[PDB]
Amino acid sequence: SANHLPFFFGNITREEAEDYLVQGGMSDGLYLLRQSRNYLGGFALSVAHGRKAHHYTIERELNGTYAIAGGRTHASPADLCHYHSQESDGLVCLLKKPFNRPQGVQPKTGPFEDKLIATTAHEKMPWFHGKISREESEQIVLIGSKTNGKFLIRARDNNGSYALCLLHEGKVLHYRIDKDKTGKLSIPEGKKFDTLWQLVEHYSYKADGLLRVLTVPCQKI
């Protein structure tokens, strides 16, 4: 699908997409497309309207079709833009001009690999150490070549519930990761994610409630 779209930027952050909106002209109806960072397989739509950027999450439905939350299904993300370019339907305005990728610029692929496969890809990742107790997690973090932001994720007493251990000025910080009814992982009062690696890539880029940003993953035993 949308890997060859001129306005598909990729796994860029929400802020970076807004910077491109100011580079494009911020004319109301200017839009671009990027990869969603907290909804697996879904997309995100960044539209500028009234001197502000507006973001809409294009979720991938169960049948393989993409649709906005509380909306009608579209074959591909391009079709959704084409539909919303002629019909407003719940958005701020109609999509007028796309902001094609500037020259030199390619789709940004992040450490997501730098449905089934995604859900069980964390087992082999360096920051995931599996099921360990709290005392074991702090020991393993405290005894290596340590540096601020060194972290790991462990499985809590529940299978499906995880816990984040982060190093901050000699102290191992413990953050709880809980599952909701939908099945989305989130830190208390934090943004919800579909997978753990999306939680890592978000928190390794911005503090967002944490005392510091995740940096280097602790190597697993």
Numbering used by the authors: 9 to 122, 156 to 262
Show me the paper's own sentences about this structure:
The catalytic activity of Syk‐family tyrosine kinases is regulated by a tandem Src homology 2 module (tSH2 module). Syk and ZAP‐70 share a common domain architecture, which includes two SH2 domains connected by a helical linker, comprising the tSH2 module. Syk is recruited to these phosphorylated ITAMs through its tandem Src homology 2 module (tSH2 module) and is activated by ITAM binding. The binding of the tSH2 module to phosphorylated immunoreceptor tyrosine‐based activation motifs necessitates a conformational change, thereby relieving kinase inhibition and promoting activation.
We now present the crystal structure of the isolated, ITAM‐free tSH2 module of Syk, which has not been previously reported. We find that, unlike the ZAP‐70 tSH2 module, the ITAM‐free Syk tSH2 module adopts a conformation remarkably similar to that observed in the ITAM complex and distinct from the conformation observed in the autoinhibited kinase structure. 18 Additionally, while some of the crystal packing interfaces are similar to those of the ITAM‐bound complex, not all of the interfaces are the same, suggesting that similarity in conformation is not due to crystal packing. Overall, the tSH2 modules in our ITAM‐free structure represent a set of conformations in which the SH2 domains have moved apart, with respect to the ITAM‐bound structure. The structure of the ITAM‐free Syk tSH2 module described here suggests that it favors the conformation corresponding to the ON state, unlike the tSH2 module of ZAP‐70, which prefers the conformation of the OFF state. Conversely, we find that the C‐SH2 of Syk is relatively rigid, even in the unbound state, and does not undergo a similar conformational rearrangement upon binding a peptide. 27 This observation, as well as our HDX‐MS data, indicate that our crystal structure reflects the solution structure of the Syk tSH2 module.
